[PDB]
Structures are given as C-alpha cells and as structure tokens.
C-alpha cells in the first residue's frame, strides 16, 4: 500500500522500524533460552508450551506495579498524591518508584511462579528443589523482566511506538502460530473454522468501531475570546472514550475469580473445596455470570478512577473554561458523571462480551482449549496496532509541508 | 468511602501476584496461565501573555 511504501522511503521511519524489528528478534532469542536448574524435557499440562523461559515472567510485574502505583494515587498514600500534583518531576519520581516496585514484585512473583512450577509437573521439573536454587531462578526471572523493561525503553526511544505495548503485542502474536499449528494438526470442520474466522474479523471490526469512538463534550474557554470566526472544524472539546478503562477490569475480575480457588486449595481438600472449584470456573454458567458481573462492576469503578469527573470538573473550573450552558462548579461534575454513566454501560457490556467470547468459541468450534482466540488479547493487539500506525502516520505527515509555490 | 474499596482492589491484585502458591489442580478451568497474556500499560491520569505593539 501507499503509506507503507512511504514509510520505507523515509530514512528515519525505516531506520526506527528496522530497529524495532531487531528488538523483537532479541526478545524472541531470549524466549528460546531456558532457565538453568529446570529440566523442561518433560514435554506439558496445557497452555504451558514454552512458559519456562528467561522471559517467562513477561512484563506482568511491570503492569501490576503500574496499576498498583496508579491505584495508590487516589488518597491512600498522600506522598503519592503529592508526587502526582508536583508536576513532571513528581511523575519522574513516581516512575522511579514504579521501577523499584516492578523489580520487587517481579522477584515475589518469580518465587511464587517457580514454587508453583515445581508443584505442577510432579516435582521432577526443578532439579534439587531447594530454596537456594529458587532464589537463583527468581533472580534469573527478575533479570529477564528487567531486560524486557530495558528493551521497552530502548524501543520507545530509538524505536517506533510504546515500548511495553510493543512487547506485549509481540508476546501475543508470537503465541499465535503455535495455536495455528494445533488447529492444523487437529483438523463440516473446515466450514466451521471458516465461520469462526469470519466471526473473528467481524469482532475485530466491532472492536475498532467501539474503541475509536469519542463523545466530544464541547468546551468554551473564558480567557481567550474567539475574536475571529474560524472554520469551526477543530473546535476545542473534551473527548471521552466509550471504553475508558481498557482491559484493566478483566485483570481485576480474574483476580477476584482465581483467588478463592487458590485459598481453597490452600485449605486442603474438603467438600467445600470441590464446591468452590466447581462454582468459580468461568467456563461453566455459574462462574461465567460472576465473571460478567465482576467485569461490569470493575469497569464502572475503574472508569470512575480514570476519568474522575469531580477532579476534571475542578480542573475545568480552576483554569478558565466550562461547558456551554452549565455552571462550572458542581453542575459540570454531575453532567460529566451522567455522560460517563451512559458510556460506561456501553463499554462495560462490550468488554464483558469480548471477555466471555472464547468460552462460546471453544464450545462451537471445538478448538484446543488453550487457544482463547478472540479474548482480551484481541483488544490489546488491536489497540497496539492502531496506536503504532497513528504514531507512524504522524511522523510521516510532518514532511508533508507543501507551500503555495510547489 | 472509596479508600476501603481501593485498598481491597490493591490487596486482591497483590493476591494475583502471589496466585501461584498452587498450580497443581493438569489443565482445567484455571485462568492464571491464561492471564499471563491479558495486560496493557494503563493510561496515565490527568501566567498572562503579552505582545509587542509596534508603535
């Protein structure tokens, strides 16, 4: 196509996209190296295909540290709130604490992941299962996560787009081809798979339609009088997304849906352990309904954390502008709150339907159960692809300054 | 209030961090290895001018 050829023509865009592909090569190279004290020649429960690499932690603890540090800013740690009101230097200090938090949480989750991995294969996964080798491979996994964050910062400095987003996208799309190999090895089946592919493309179109939509609240400004009549096409407004959270409520819902099975397996095996494990399975229609309700409640909570209509009404009043017709104190807060109620209902139902779609895909296509094609990984892939394309179009567009002589 | 639900959410996501104290019961309705790949980076939160009149 035209824009991709123009990306390859421009020296800077082609150079940084080459550097991005090289960093993804480096990521895949680090994936194909195993941890020292692990056997891994025992190839396999399910969905644990490689899963025991240097990057087996992934960038999971950086996202967990980021959502934790982001959650603490709304008046739990007032030191963090005053970091958040200090400006860019306070945000730099928050990012430094985020780096410390992701190193610490990567160590903790590496310990838990290693002790669970030894608990999974039958004990014969790790050789000499002592605490010293657990500390060793926890250091290895946290070093893998630290190198992944360093790769993200390198690929957002000299590379294309966001760093962590490109790495998460790399993880998902590198998980695609083994799923395709399992499909082709497993197999009216062909027209069934074609109908699933048509449903996947329809779901991608629906995801782009929901995601790239804005509610444009118009905003007048008091300080700058519009003394000249403009073309009106680029008027100032406040865009609210339809899905203001993203995929964070799915993380909160799966935390709430896997915590009682882990504590019920901690308790031991009783009747209530079997009842908890049978009733908190979201593949079954008593667990899926709890999953949907948790997703809806958590996206309401998280989009009131994200937008925060009281703080945005305060920010609108404190510098000038307002919404035309509405007084800028309490009334803009109630107005933006009602707009947010409607939009969060729509984006809520969208996110819940997307998150429970692979349950109805496995029970219609009879795919491998560890596929989960059409989940929230689709949402992450679509968001990273469209944001990276928008960034590349911006860097392409600057050059397109013509002038009236031409 | 909202500090209570916020700290409940934070302690539950740290329980997600240590949600690997059991992994054995081999493949069933377990989402943790599935939740290894559902993340995005969460989005961040959010004088007088003058001019020279050429006299």
């Amino acid at each position: 196509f035209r824009t991709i050829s123009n990306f390859m023509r421009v020296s800077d865009i082609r150079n940084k996209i080459i550097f991005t592909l090289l960093m993804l090569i480096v990521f895949r190279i680090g994936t194909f190296i195993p941890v020292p004290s692990v056997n891994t020649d025992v190839l396999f429960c399910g969905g644990a295909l490689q899963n025991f690499s240097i990057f087996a932690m992934g960038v999971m603890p950086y996202i967990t540290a980021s959502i934790i540090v982001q959650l603490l800013q709304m008046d739990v740690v007032p030191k963090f709130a005053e970091w958040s009101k200090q400006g860019e230097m306070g945000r730099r200090k928050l990012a430094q604490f985020t780096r410390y938090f992701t190193i610490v949480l990567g160590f903790i989750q590496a310990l838990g992941m290693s002790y669970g991995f030894n608990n999974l294969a039958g004990g014969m996964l790790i050789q000499n299962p002592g605490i010293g080798t657990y500390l060793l491979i926890a250091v290895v996994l946290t070093a893998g996560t630290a190198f992944l964050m360093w790769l993200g910062e390198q690929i957002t400095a000299k590379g294309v787009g966001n760093g962590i987003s490109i790495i998460i996208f790399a993880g998902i799309v590198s998980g695609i081809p083994t799923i395709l190999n399992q499909i082709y090895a497993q197999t009216l089946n062909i027209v069934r798979l074609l109908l699933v592919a048509l449903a996947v493309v329809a779901v991608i179109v629906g995801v782009i339609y929901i995601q790239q939509a804005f509610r444009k609240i118009p905003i007048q400004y008091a300080k700058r009088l519009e003394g000249r009549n403009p073309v009106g096409g680029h008027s100032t407004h406040l865009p609210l997304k339809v899905n203001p959270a993203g995929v964070i409520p799915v993380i909160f819902a799966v935390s709430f849906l896997i915590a009682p099975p882990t504590i019920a397996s901690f308790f031991g095996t009783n009747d209530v352990t079997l009842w908890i494990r049978r009733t908190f399975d979201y593949t079954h229609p008593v667990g899926m309904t709890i999953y949907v309700v948790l997703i809806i409640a958590f996206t309401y909570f998280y989009a009131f954390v994200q937008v925060n209509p009281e703080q945005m009404a305060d920010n609108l009043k404190k510098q000038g502008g307002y919404i035309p017709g509405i007084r800028p104190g309490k009334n803009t807060q109630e107005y933006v709150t009602r707009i947010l109620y409607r939009l969060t209902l729509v984006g809520s139902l969208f996110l819940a339907f997307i998150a429970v779609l692979p349950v109805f895909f496995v029970n219609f296509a009879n795919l491998p159960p560890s596929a989960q094609i059409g989940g929230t990984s689709l949402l992450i892939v679509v968001g990273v692809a469209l944001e990276t394309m928008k960034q590349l179009e911006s860097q392409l567009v600057k050059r397109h300054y013509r002038g009236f002589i031409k | 209030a909202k500090k209570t639900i916020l700290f409940l959410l934070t302690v539950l996501t740290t329980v997600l961090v240590s949600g690997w104290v059991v992994l054995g019961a081999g493949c069933s309705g377990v989402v943790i290895l599935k939740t290894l790949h559902m993340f995005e980076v969460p989005f961040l939160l959010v004088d007088s001018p003058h001019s020279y009149h050429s006299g």
Binding site: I204, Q212, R215, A385 | -
Partner: protein
Amino acid sequence: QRVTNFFKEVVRELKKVSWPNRKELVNYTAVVLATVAFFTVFFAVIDLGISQLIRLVF
C-alpha cells in the same frame, strides 16, 4: 420505571458519540489485519530459523 428511561437515555447518548465512518473503519481494519498477518509470519519464520540454529549448534 426508571430503568426504561435510563436505557432510552443510553440510546440517546449513543447518537452523540462520534463513531468512525465506513472508509476509516475499513482502512483501520486493513492496518490491523495486515500487522497481525505480518507479525504472525515474522514470528513463525524466526521461531523456525532459530530452532534450526539451536539444533545445529547443540
């Protein structure tokens, strides 16, 4: 009673959202499907190549 009014207001609110048109929708879908296909082929090729390299180097 209030639930029907609330859902009526929801569909009234959805008519003010600035949805993308047809042409940018199919353009965006072309971008995301092209990038998914390219990175699928990319990661498959590199996985096969470095697996053959590992089985060569031992």
